[PDB]
Amino acid sequence: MVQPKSQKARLFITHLLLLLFIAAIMFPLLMVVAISLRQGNFVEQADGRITPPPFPVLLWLWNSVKVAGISAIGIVALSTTCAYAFARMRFPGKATLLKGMLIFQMFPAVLSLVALYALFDRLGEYIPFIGLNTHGGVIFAYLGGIALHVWTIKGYFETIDSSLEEAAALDGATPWQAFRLVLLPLSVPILAVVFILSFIAAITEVPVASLLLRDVNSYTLAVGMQQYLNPQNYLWGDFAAAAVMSALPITIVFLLAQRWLVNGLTAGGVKG
Amino acid sequence: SVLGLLGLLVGYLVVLMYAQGEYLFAITTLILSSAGLYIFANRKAYAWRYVYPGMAGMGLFVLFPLVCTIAIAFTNYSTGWKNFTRVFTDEGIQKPFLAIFVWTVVFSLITVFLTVAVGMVLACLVQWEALRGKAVYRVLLILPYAVPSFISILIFKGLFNSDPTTARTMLIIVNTWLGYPYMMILCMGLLKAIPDDLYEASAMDGAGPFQNFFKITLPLLIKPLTPLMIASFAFNFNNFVLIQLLTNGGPDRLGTTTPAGYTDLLVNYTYRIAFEGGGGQDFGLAAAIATLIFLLVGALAI
Amino acid sequence: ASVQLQNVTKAWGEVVVSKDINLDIHEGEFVVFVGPSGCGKSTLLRMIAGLETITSGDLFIGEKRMNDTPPAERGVGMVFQSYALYPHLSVAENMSFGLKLAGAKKEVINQRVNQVAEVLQLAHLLDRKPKALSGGQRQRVAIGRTLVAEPSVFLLDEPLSNLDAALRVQMRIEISRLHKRLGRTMIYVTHDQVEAMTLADKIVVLDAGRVAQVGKPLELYHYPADRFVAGFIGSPKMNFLPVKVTATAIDQVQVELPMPNRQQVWLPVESRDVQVGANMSLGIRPEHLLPSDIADVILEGEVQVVEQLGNETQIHIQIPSIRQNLVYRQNDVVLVEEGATFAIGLPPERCHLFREDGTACRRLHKEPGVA
Amino acid sequence: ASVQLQNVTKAWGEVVVSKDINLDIHEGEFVVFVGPSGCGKSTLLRMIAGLETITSGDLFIGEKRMNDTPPAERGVGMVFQSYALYPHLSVAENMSFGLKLAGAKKEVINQRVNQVAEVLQLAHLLDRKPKALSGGQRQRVAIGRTLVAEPSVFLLDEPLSNLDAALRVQMRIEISRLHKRLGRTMIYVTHDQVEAMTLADKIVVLDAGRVAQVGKPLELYHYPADRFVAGFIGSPKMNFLPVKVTATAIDQVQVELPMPNRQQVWLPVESRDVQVGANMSLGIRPEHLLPSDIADVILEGEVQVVEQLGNETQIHIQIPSIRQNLVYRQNDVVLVEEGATFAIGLPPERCHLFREDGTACRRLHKEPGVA
Ligand SMILES: Nc1ncnc2c1ncn2[C@@H]1O[C@H](COP(=O)(O)OP(=O)(O)O)[C@@H](O)[C@H]1O
Ligand SMILES: Nc1ncnc2c1ncn2[C@@H]1O[C@H](COP(=O)(O)OP(=O)(O)O)[C@@H](O)[C@H]1O
Ligand code: VO4
Ligand code: VO4
Ligand SMILES: [Mg+2]
């Protein structure tokens, strides 16, 4: 039997340890106590009464989820293409580009805010990636410049055996057809993982607040909670309600991508 | 011919760039347009055809803003080398600067080690088929990314109500709690790709769970995680205006003047001769110290 | 370890790949499993090792039930068909993994690894990742890993598939030496008749997930107990002829060949249950067919295919009124061209008689080398 | 498409896995590659297909340089050593992948896939992923992919390594029929002498990335060029007795046997480039050793190991003089126990002679078969 003896012991120890870890890392995330101090906060973000900032469920949550989904889809596509190229074909300057892109990946916002604000207010002319408050030009599909995911799909591509796409190429498939019909279906868990990471990064993105010109109506829920955080009152009992609301889309996206994740994809493929 | 008409519409814009007097913008847009058009039109550069969109997006997202900042470092914005001579002769904080950088690098190393270890262990545990509540367990485990990392500190401060060593320990533990799910998702993805036949052989060799992990799971995951570990090390080395509520005031571990703000990692140690341009809109000096930190961390990385 | 199996039945849902296997391997016995591709050999090896569950029946190893014992504590070692090689370790690390895990010593492990690499002719490739290797070298690395380990049971699974003839011979000699040194029970799965007939004290011939016969190699070659086993044992499959029984004696059955002259011969086979008029199935091995210079029925035919092997010539004759072609193995090089006439003699004493259901009438001829 | 390589040399860093290869394959030729385990057969195959890059030389396919041509356009279909199959596709999808990529019709795809699967015995497996397929079935799917394709060049890389005797015979027959029907170039790599001699129009033997000899199968068997090919073609390997020269006639050499009686025999071998007193290496094939009843010179010794193969008996004799064992092959079953004395005769007309370098003086004996 593959199942080992004394499994109940290891299973029980693992369950107890995981439960204790869950409690320890959930206690600081018990943010709902400040909300449920008064039930009027859920004031009344979900429905009813009047709240000076607009009802997050229909506006801020929707904007955040739309931006996150679009950015994640574009990021996944671009990163998977770049990683396939880098990992499994040759072109001059490849190594130099990898080392460069790694170095230029890392940067703080102390330069980002001024440089990107200059970029946006210099853009000015008419293109769909409108620099100023757009909700469709900034952030939206414009978070696309990513290095971690390019590296991640590349490294995953290095794991998969090459002989599969070698046989595909020997069958007359162009590299595009091979990449579409062999490499991606066996590499789909990494696309799921990177999609998850991109969605969470886009959802919880407080910096790059280029939507400040139009700061009441539709814009990102992160900047919305930042507006909730006001110096002269430090009002939090309703501010954290938007955070607990934004806890939901990540859970839903994680479950949807969980339906994708699977092991043993390259099972029984090649010998040796 | 369709890819040729698209260039003209882009090419019509390049006139407006020169019309508005922004020669650098005109140069960048003409360069990118010519590169894309030629790469697509010529059939020989298939790999460059695959590479161009991502590289161009990366350029316009990071590289141009970064080089603009380095250029700002060489002008007053209120110069060439006077700001760099100043930051070199910055003796008033030079001795604290070295020690602050040392503590920052030690802190980043220990926190990236702890984060990777915790994430990998949890991903391997959830990978187990004998575990029953896999889905609920892993969703509750990823949950710590729900907070946008701006008031998790506030609730921590509310639940905790001195001892700069304790401040450092709280710093490290809050980074681990806030960053482990990233490495856990990464290790889940990378654990999906391990062939099971190696585990079969290792079991044939008498390997238990711990030995099996340390011998097959760890070495096959540490290899694709190395670039990710380096990047996460850089991210845990430098920070910005976000997740800033730990250590309200100045802990003064190494004579550091730290605000009501977290991540003292060579940013809050210098906020006032820095931040919004040295506190008095000296963005030239701010960009100069930013260029210095970029240069030395790049030296460390290689 | 006296590996024993009783009513071991496997099932992948509804299909059954192992049906009532009752094996019995004594301590320190060499047993070889041979069967048609997909009979269940690898599944049976895994079930013995524990890589796959046993649905019903009892598996005994060393007089201890091992149905639910984990594969690590089973105390067995297996050579995988995919070689189960670690990609992230050199050849030395791959072969020394087991001894390093089981209480390493830093000198005896090194000595054992160097000796095994030397006797596998793997010295110069001691520090190369399995990517930088050939198929034969990978298979030999798996063999060396198993040999460096000292398992109670050696579960070798086709370890000589990607090797030239001289290397196969040397590997067989080395495995025989290791067996005669250790005295450990070993189970060997192979598709080579030379390997099976050489390295065996007992052979098991699987067929669609069931045991067809068990015995000595000479017993299997000389007195096959089933039509399938008789067709399986031997590299050129034995020529089978449909035939009608005409009369039965006390200890010999006479039969009537389907050729036009319908000559009848007396076969010294068991007469029990043999019914006059049954549609039998005569079988004669290609090597046993004598040239036509012997007074006999003489199956004259016409040549179709001549295969030259250097040391022997294989002639396929299309006998009239015969669906298949009799295969004839003459010694040395014979210059016979296609479309020519050829005749062969049928030894009465070398013929196996098979009934309609596939069973065999037991032969009554005392062949040499079989007790 | 004809395949010809001109001074092709591939070097992995320092290691020269292929050195100055000069092969020429005409249209419709069944060239079979044999050699030691790791001499460079698979590397040559991959470099012909284009998966590897040659460090020198030129590779012509259809009289056009293909050093820089990608694998798609070369028109080479290869059956891998590792059964390179797509695990996310069932058997039918795996086989029809190439046709679907070619954009053929569904009806043609289905008809041809069924046709191939019928002869490869996979009809009931036609709806399964490779994870549930045994090793032999995986190999058969690997072969069937190229079979249902129609590439101008067939690169079969050890295709029948994990198949039983009868199934391997059937696969040989089907592949030979396929080649006869089509008339396309097929390069075959095998470790089966039966396969090589029964399928090859021309055999190529490699040795450490170097071509040893190229010619007909029986030509290789009868007149080997060097010691390596002489000991490699034919199993078991040929016996080798170091000898000393005494007198060289016009067309025959007198070697002095190392026995204490110093019997000298005249070998009908080329007398060019041999000096009186040189130290040559005599070689006699095992199957050609004669019984001691009728012979001129007898090589008396004692039996060490006797292998009973059923259709034949192999006897190892320890001669007091030569250190090796004279491997002897006798037809049928002979009952000789170990430790008993045994004497065999040496037929002078059937022995090869070799120099210390390795080159063999050509035999003056007109062996039958070879022109
Ligand atoms: N990547 C590699 N680097 C160095 N040597 C290699 C590499 N791959 C194979 N070799 C060696 O080079 C020779 C080529 O043989 P191989 O590629 O295994 O195929 P084959 O044995 O069928 O010719 C072998 O000795 C092999 O061990
Ligand atoms: N998961 C599975 N489900 C159903 N049938 C299987 C499965 N795996 C293998 N088989 C089939 O069952 C038989 C078992 O053979 P296999 O497991 O391939 O090993 P071997 O051929 O070495 O005995 C084969 O016919 C194989 O195709
Ligand atoms: O791929 V091989 O080393 O068996 O010629
Ligand atoms: O179907 V196999 O006995 O070659 O694993
Ligand atoms: Mg098998």
Side-chain angles (χ1 to χ4, degrees):
Chain A
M1 181 45 148
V2 283
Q3 164 174 90
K5 268 283 191 61
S6 303
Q7 189 87 311
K8 203 200 151 173
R10 292 223 281 275
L11 201 73
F12 170 70
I13 275 299
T14 292
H15 273 301
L16 189 138
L17 261 64
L18 265 196
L19 196 150
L20 260 52
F21 189 73
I22 270 179
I25 71 98
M26 211 56 38
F27 191 98
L29 204 33
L30 282 205
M31 250 171 176
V32 316
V33 281
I35 308 314
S36 55
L37 281 188
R38 51 210 47 75
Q39 269 275 359
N41 284 309
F42 254 46
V43 285
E44 277 295 349
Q45 298 339 301
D47 67 49
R49 287 291 299 107
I50 53 181
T51 287
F55 275 62
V57 53
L58 205 42
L59 207 36
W60 284 357
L61 188 74
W62 167 244
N63 304 156
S64 194
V65 66
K66 156 194 277 205
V67 154
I70 295 301
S71 285
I73 295 301
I75 279 178
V76 165
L78 293 193
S79 36
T80 206
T81 56
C82 289
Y84 168 59
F86 270 114
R88 333 290 300 290
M89 56 192 23
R90 94 191 71 101
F91 54 111
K94 155 204 178 182
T96 80
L97 288 194
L98 293 120
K99 320 284 151 172
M101 171 285 288
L102 209 52
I103 292 321
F104 307 101
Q105 176 281 332
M106 161 265 278
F107 68 105
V110 65
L111 50 99
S112 299
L113 293 202
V114 53
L116 276 304
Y117 156 64
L119 199 44
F120 296 142
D121 78 330
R122 170 65 288 162
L123 199 284
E125 301 76 60
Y126 65 112
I127 38 181
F129 266 51
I130 298 101
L132 71 173
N133 44 287
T134 321
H135 164 45
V138 79
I139 316 291
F140 184 96
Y142 164 100
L143 304 169
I146 298 314
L148 281 293
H149 304 142
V150 168
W151 271 109
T152 319
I153 300 74
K154 164 182 150 102
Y156 196 101
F157 280 171
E158 317 274 17
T159 279
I160 288 312
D161 181 352
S162 45
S163 57
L164 310 183
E165 61 156 320
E166 315 187 1
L170 276 177
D171 247 11
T174 203
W176 176 246
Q177 273 154 280
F179 161 68
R180 273 195 328 113
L181 296 192
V182 171
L183 197 51
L184 277 202
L186 308 180
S187 187
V188 80
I190 207 63
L191 296 319
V193 152
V194 160
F195 171 67
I196 300 165
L197 295 191
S198 315
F199 189 88
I200 316 170
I203 277 287
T204 85
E205 185 67 49
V206 153
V208 193
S210 315
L211 294 180
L212 89 160
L213 291 98
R214 204 161 60 131
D215 211 7
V216 308
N217 92 354
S218 165
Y219 72 81
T220 288
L221 186 134
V223 200
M225 298 163 286
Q226 207 278 357
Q227 182 263 288
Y228 253 90
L229 192 85
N230 160 271
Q232 57 64 48
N233 64 353
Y234 280 3
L235 177 53
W236 303 301
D238 36 23
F239 150 91
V244 68
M245 286 305 218
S246 85
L248 243 193
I250 307 166
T251 298
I252 297 180
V253 164
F254 186 59
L255 299 188
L256 262 81
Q258 263 284 280
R259 186 244 41 82
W260 250 252
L261 280 180
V262 64
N263 59 337
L265 278 181
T266 181
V270 298
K271 86 187 305 181
Chain B
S1 280
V2 182
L3 78 173
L5 70 91
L6 298 187
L8 307 182
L9 308 179
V10 185
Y12 165 66
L13 308 179
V14 199
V15 178
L16 285 108
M17 314 314 78
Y18 207 98
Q20 79 185 2
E22 282 285 40
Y23 312 127
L24 83 170
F25 219 92
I27 284 168
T28 53
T29 188
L30 73 88
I31 276 300
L32 268 203
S33 45
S34 37
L37 298 156
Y38 164 90
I39 286 295
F40 283 137
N42 204 7
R43 196 55 76 246
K44 136 164 169 267
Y46 193 50
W48 266 101
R49 192 138 74 251
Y50 276 18
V51 161
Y52 176 79
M55 211 205 88
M58 181 65 98
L60 201 35
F61 190 82
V62 178
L63 278 141
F64 190 83
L66 169 77
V67 304
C68 288
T69 301
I70 320 172
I72 290 309
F74 305 133
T75 190
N76 44 293
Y77 197 87
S78 307
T79 50
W81 289 107
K82 57 201 69 162
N83 279 3
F84 269 69
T85 51
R86 158 49 192 161
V87 307
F88 285 156
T89 46
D90 200 356
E91 169 55 19
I93 71 155
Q94 164 134 355
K95 182 42 64 193
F97 166 80
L98 263 281
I100 283 304
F101 145 83
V102 163
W103 145 246
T104 287
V105 83
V106 154
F107 158 98
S108 308
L109 180 53
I110 188 187
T111 198
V112 59
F113 162 67
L114 278 192
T115 303
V116 171
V118 166
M120 202 172 344
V121 167
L122 293 169
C124 176
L125 279 167
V126 165
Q127 253 287 7
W128 207 9
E129 190 60 39
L131 268 198
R132 271 152 74 168
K134 285 185 306 297
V136 54
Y137 274 164
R138 70 180 97 185
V139 71
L140 279 165
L141 263 284
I142 166 63
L143 225 46
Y145 262 12
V147 51
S149 74
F150 215 51
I151 171 150
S152 45
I153 316 98
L154 201 53
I155 192 88
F156 254 122
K157 194 50 169 205
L159 64 94
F160 166 52
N161 287 121
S162 48
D163 193 326
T165 322
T166 289
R168 295 213 227 198
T169 297
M170 225 81 87
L171 224 35
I172 288 177
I173 195 68
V174 83
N175 269 348
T176 36
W177 169 83
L178 195 128
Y180 86 85
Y182 170 57
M183 309 275 158
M184 172 215 276
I185 301 179
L186 278 181
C187 284
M188 215 166 342
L190 298 185
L191 257 185
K192 293 313 159 303
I194 282 192
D196 193 305
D197 200 78
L198 325 182
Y199 278 75
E200 292 225 310
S202 61
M204 275 298 82
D205 283 355
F210 294 71
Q211 308 141 86
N212 189 310
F213 178 84
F214 279 118
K215 293 296 200 310
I216 270 164
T217 320
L218 184 60
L220 282 172
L221 284 206
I222 204 163
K223 171 76 67 211
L225 262 188
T226 311
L228 305 180
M229 291 192 207
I230 292 177
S232 182
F233 153 75
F235 162 56
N236 297 276
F237 169 72
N238 59 9
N239 291 119
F240 51 89
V241 201
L242 181 53
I243 184 184
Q244 28 170 39
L245 282 161
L246 279 302
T247 70
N248 313 59
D252 283 288
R253 290 245 59 174
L254 295 157
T256 174
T257 55
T258 301
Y262 164 67
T263 175
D264 198 14
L265 326 171
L266 216 70
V267 282
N268 321 134
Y269 155 77
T270 185
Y271 55 68
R272 54 151 160 71
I273 201 64
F275 187 14
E276 262 283 330
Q281 318 313 130
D282 219 345
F283 283 129
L285 274 305
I289 171 179
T291 308
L292 198 37
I293 193 166
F294 176 90
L295 174 136
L296 45 59
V297 58
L300 196 154
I302 299 184
Chain C
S2 67
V3 177
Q4 191 172 3
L5 290 91
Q6 294 187 6
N7 308 114
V8 184
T9 278
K10 178 65 168 182
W12 295 93
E14 163 295 336
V15 307
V16 185
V17 287
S18 292
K19 175 174 47 92
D20 280 84
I21 288 95
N22 299 0
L23 282 178
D24 185 2
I25 299 109
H26 290 171
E27 155 97 357
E29 213 168 7
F30 212 120
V31 176
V32 283
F33 288 170
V34 301
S37 175
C39 42
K41 290 173 309 302
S42 294
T43 298
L44 193 43
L45 291 173
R46 286 156 79 91
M47 272 194 307
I48 282 184
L51 292 191
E52 297 177 358
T53 89
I54 290 183
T55 78
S56 167
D58 320 301
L59 187 142
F60 283 172
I61 281 191
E63 330 312 316
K64 291 213 310 213
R65 162 80 95 80
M66 295 262 151
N67 230 351
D68 43 88
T69 287
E73 286 106 9
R74 288 274 258 259
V76 305
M78 173 166 155
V79 182
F80 287 68
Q81 209 164 10
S82 57
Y83 318 141
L85 281 177
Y86 306 135
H88 63 283
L89 296 185
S90 59
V91 152
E93 300 156 303
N94 251 303
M95 279 168 24
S96 77
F97 198 62
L99 279 176
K100 169 155 305 291
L101 259 166
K105 258 303 299 174
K106 188 52 74 168
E107 64 199 70
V108 77
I109 171 181
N110 176 13
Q111 173 211 300
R112 192 99 58 77
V113 159
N114 265 125
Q115 194 262 9
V116 161
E118 181 176 279
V119 306
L120 288 203
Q121 317 182 12
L122 229 50
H124 42 286
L125 318 97
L126 260 194
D127 48 40
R128 306 237 292 249
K129 304 262 193 304
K131 303 144 35 199
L133 277 190
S134 73
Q137 293 148 349
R138 284 208 201 86
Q139 198 157 59
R140 292 204 302 277
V141 160
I143 299 177
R145 181 171 55 183
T146 293
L147 297 210
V148 156
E150 292 270 66
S152 163
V153 178
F154 290 78
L155 297 179
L156 299 114
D157 184 328
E158 303 192 12
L160 307 187
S161 318
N162 305 59
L163 309 184
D164 43 296
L167 213 31
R168 282 229 301 290
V169 164
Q170 294 171 58
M171 291 315 98
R172 284 195 303 107
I173 295 284
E174 169 73 67
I175 280 181
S176 296
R177 294 211 272 112
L178 185 60
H179 173 58
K180 272 191 68 214
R181 195 178 85 228
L182 298 191
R184 259 81 171 287
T185 285
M186 309 165 68
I187 292 75
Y188 194 90
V189 169
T190 183
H191 291 320
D192 213 332
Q193 300 307 309
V194 175
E195 295 176 53
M197 301 284 317
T198 43
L199 322 173
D201 316 302
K202 180 181 320 293
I203 323 159
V204 183
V205 278
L206 297 190
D207 171 356
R210 108 183 180 286
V211 160
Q213 203 176 357
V214 159
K216 286 290 183 59
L218 263 285
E219 188 109 14
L220 281 192
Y221 173 88
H222 270 308
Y223 305 118
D226 185 359
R227 165 77 162 274
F228 161 82
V229 166
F232 195 36
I233 290 299
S235 35
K237 87 171 294 194
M238 157 189 27
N239 314 282
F240 291 123
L241 285 77
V243 50
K244 146 173 294 313
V245 164
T246 48
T248 67
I250 311 179
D251 265 357
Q252 32 170 54
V253 173
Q254 86 158 11
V255 312
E256 176 254 330
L257 300 138
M259 50 185 198
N261 46 352
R262 65 183 64 274
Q263 201 160 1
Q264 305 173 62
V265 290
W266 280 101
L267 297 193
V269 298
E270 277 194 359
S271 320
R272 280 182 308 105
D273 165 281
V274 176
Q275 294 301 84
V276 164
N279 284 359
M280 262 316 98
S281 170
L282 194 144
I284 173 73
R285 301 221 181 249
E287 38 265 23
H288 300 167
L289 283 156
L290 330 170
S292 173
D293 295 356
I294 303 309
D296 185 49
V297 287
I298 303 310
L299 292 148
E300 182 262 291
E302 156 197 293
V303 176
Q304 293 314 293
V305 176
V306 162
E307 297 180 358
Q308 303 283 356
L309 269 286
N311 56 297
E312 73 185 309
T313 300
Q314 320 216 137
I315 299 112
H316 304 236
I317 319 198
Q318 190 272 302
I319 305 265
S321 81
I322 290 293
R323 286 299 160 294
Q324 295 316 294
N325 300 350
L326 316 189
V327 186
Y328 182 28
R329 288 177 49 174
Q330 193 146 61
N331 191 240
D332 223 299
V333 165
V334 186
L335 267 193
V336 176
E337 57 276 14
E338 299 85 0
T341 168
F342 214 114
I344 45 171
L346 215 62
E349 74 272 3
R350 299 288 199 120
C351 292
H352 308 121
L353 192 53
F354 301 85
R355 308 195 191 77
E356 306 207 80
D357 49 9
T359 77
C361 295
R362 164 63 212 240
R363 275 223 287 163
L364 296 186
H365 179 73
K366 285 292 315 182
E367 291 272 7
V370 175
Chain D
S2 59
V3 169
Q4 159 199 353
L5 315 82
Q6 267 195 79
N7 309 121
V8 152
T9 283
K10 156 88 95 173
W12 290 95
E14 171 272 354
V15 201
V16 284
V17 308
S18 279
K19 304 182 301 142
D20 212 337
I21 291 205
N22 281 47
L23 290 163
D24 183 6
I25 312 168
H26 310 109
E27 184 86 349
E29 225 170 10
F30 207 138
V31 278
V32 172
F33 286 177
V34 287
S37 163
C39 64
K41 313 176 304 302
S42 301
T43 303
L44 199 42
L45 272 193
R46 304 248 314 298
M47 301 183 6
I48 285 188
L51 300 160
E52 289 302 335
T53 53
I54 71 183
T55 51
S56 99
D58 316 64
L59 165 66
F60 294 109
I61 293 197
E63 276 58 25
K64 182 196 157 210
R65 189 168 186 254
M66 306 271 164
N67 295 26
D68 37 19
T69 309
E73 320 182 7
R74 300 210 198 181
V76 152
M78 158 179 196
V79 174
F80 274 73
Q81 208 164 12
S82 312
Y83 333 116
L85 310 165
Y86 324 106
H88 60 306
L89 261 61
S90 63
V91 159
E93 283 146 321
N94 262 277
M95 262 205 278
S96 100
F97 199 58
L99 292 133
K100 210 179 62 57
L101 281 160
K105 274 205 302 312
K106 174 61 64 79
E107 310 319 288
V108 158
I109 281 178
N110 275 324
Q111 180 264 289
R112 199 141 100 217
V113 152
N114 278 323
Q115 163 103 3
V116 164
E118 162 91 18
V119 307
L120 290 211
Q121 275 149 70
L122 284 165
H124 47 292
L125 279 90
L126 211 54
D127 207 333
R128 217 167 286 170
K129 319 286 270 290
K131 183 251 299 174
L133 305 196
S134 72
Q137 295 146 342
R138 280 198 211 126
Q139 196 152 12
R140 298 217 284 291
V141 181
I143 298 175
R145 214 164 52 190
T146 295
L147 253 49
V148 77
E150 293 226 77
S152 180
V153 171
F154 289 79
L155 298 195
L156 314 167
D157 208 5
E158 282 187 356
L160 326 170
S161 52
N162 311 45
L163 304 175
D164 57 81
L167 199 34
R168 153 181 317 113
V169 164
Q170 292 176 239
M171 291 307 98
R172 283 184 40 238
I173 299 320
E174 308 300 353
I175 277 179
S176 150
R177 194 151 321 151
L178 157 74
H179 174 225
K180 272 161 202 144
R181 148 161 84 107
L182 282 196
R184 293 199 216 287
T185 290
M186 323 185 25
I187 289 88
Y188 205 114
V189 165
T190 192
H191 290 166
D192 205 64
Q193 322 278 355
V194 191
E195 261 165 79
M197 321 285 298
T198 46
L199 287 198
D201 323 312
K202 157 195 291 183
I203 309 198
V204 180
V205 177
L206 303 200
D207 162 84
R210 137 191 172 267
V211 171
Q213 199 186 349
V214 162
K216 286 276 200 53
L218 274 197
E219 188 165 359
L220 266 192
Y221 184 89
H222 280 331
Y223 304 124
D226 56 68
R227 261 195 61 123
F228 158 75
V229 58
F232 190 79
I233 281 301
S235 163
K237 74 161 63 170
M238 159 170 17
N239 316 291
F240 294 125
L241 323 175
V243 282
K244 193 242 182 173
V245 196
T246 56
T248 81
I250 178 64
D251 72 329
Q252 40 166 92
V253 198
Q254 192 184 54
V255 305
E256 171 156 301
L257 290 183
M259 300 216 297
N261 53 66
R262 324 181 71 63
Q263 182 138 348
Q264 296 143 117
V265 293
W266 282 100
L267 269 65
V269 201
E270 276 223 62
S271 68
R272 206 181 330 299
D273 303 24
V274 50
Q275 338 303 323
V276 171
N279 317 65
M280 322 276 286
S281 172
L282 194 133
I284 174 60
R285 292 227 176 251
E287 43 258 11
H288 301 167
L289 273 166
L290 255 56
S292 55
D293 54 352
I294 167 65
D296 53 70
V297 58
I298 289 143
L299 290 178
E300 203 272 346
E302 182 198 61
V303 187
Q304 289 317 115
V305 166
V306 55
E307 304 192 4
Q308 296 272 5
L309 292 184
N311 69 284
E312 82 157 1
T313 297
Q314 308 208 136
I315 305 182
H316 296 4
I317 309 184
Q318 167 127 318
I319 296 309
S321 67
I322 322 94
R323 174 149 289 82
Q324 301 316 122
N325 290 345
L326 260 66
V327 185
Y328 179 41
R329 273 178 59 167
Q330 179 121 312
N331 208 242
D332 213 357
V333 154
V334 179
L335 211 44
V336 172
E337 92 256 38
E338 312 196 321
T341 176
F342 207 90
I344 47 186
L346 193 73
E349 83 273 36
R350 275 195 139 133
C351 313
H352 313 78
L353 205 59
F354 299 84
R355 312 183 181 87
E356 71 295 20
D357 313 328
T359 75
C361 318
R362 241 202 83 88
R363 302 221 285 134
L364 269 303
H365 188 58
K366 291 302 171 304
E367 221 67 64
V370 152

